[PDB]
Amino acid sequence: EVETFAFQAEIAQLMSLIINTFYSNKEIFLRELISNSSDALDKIRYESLTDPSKLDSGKELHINLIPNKQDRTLTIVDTGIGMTKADLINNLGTIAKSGTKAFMEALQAGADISMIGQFGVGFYSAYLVAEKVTVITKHNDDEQYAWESSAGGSFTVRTDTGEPMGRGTKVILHLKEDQTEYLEERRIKEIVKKHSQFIGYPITLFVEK
Ligand SMILES: NS(=O)(=O)c1cc(Cl)sc1Cl
Numbered sequence: 001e002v003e004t005f006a007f008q009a010e011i012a013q014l015m016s017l018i019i020n021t022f023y024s025n026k027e028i029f030l031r032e033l034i035s036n037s038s039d040a041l042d043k044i045r046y047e048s049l050t051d052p053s054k055l056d057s058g059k060e061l062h063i064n065l066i067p068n069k070q071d072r073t074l075t076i077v078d079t080g081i082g083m084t085k086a087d088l089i090n091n092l093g094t095i096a097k098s099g100t101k102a103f104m105e106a107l108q109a110g111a112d113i114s115m116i117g118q119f120g121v122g123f124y125s126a127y128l129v130a131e132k133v134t135v136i137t138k139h140n141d142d143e144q145y146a147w148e149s150s151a152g153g154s155f156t157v158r159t160d161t162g163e164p165m166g167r168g169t170k171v172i173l174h175l176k177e178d179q180t181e182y183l184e185e186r187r188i189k190e191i192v193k194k195h196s197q198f199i200g201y202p203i204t205l206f207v208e209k
Helices: 009-020 028-050 085-089 096-108 113-119 122-128 177-183 185-195
Strands: 002-006 063-068 073-078 130-138 145-149 154-159 168-175 203-205
Touching: 009 096, 009 122, 028 063, 028 073, 028 113, 028 122, 028 168, 028 185, 063 177, 063 185, 085 130, 085 145, 085 154, 096 113, 113 122, 122 130, 122 168, 168 177, 177 185, 185 203
Parallel strands: 063 203
Antiparallel strands: 002 154, 063 073, 073 168, 130 145, 130 168, 145 154
């Protein structure tokens, strides 16, 4: 059972801008997704400070980067607080309408796309490098769900039948044909060292057979 939703007009316009604007500094997508993961890990850690049982779904707080050249996917896994189904439909837990408003005023006032994270909509920078994004998420208060969009004005949500996550979020980037450099180990290492050196959670870059 698959539900198809229309993006709010402002969010569709944000992703069309990300997809269509000539902008060579695409590597910042990884910084933005790791920062989102760090924020989600902060949230479940804070909740656990007064309720240890919040970590019954998994005590380890970390970020994994999983490239797969055969599938042409880069997956960012975290064990953060996750998202409910309502969070997913409500723009992945962002205030994306007002954030897009401010981002687009900043762009006409000198800003560039790399500053997208300062407006709370850094997730959508995934479409700098991905033709399709799948988000698998499990929140303590809900079931496991899969969100998916190839842009074009719509997204889908379904109950996920993949591997149980326990708790957290998995962002699967189905990379564009000309963006496979972000599957190479040395390129990912360079980006993490450049932009994510002070993230307070272990970031593990998986290797491939
Ligand atoms: N080791 S892990 O981070 O739990 C993991 C590996 C995949 Cl392939 S998908 C996913 Cl989640």
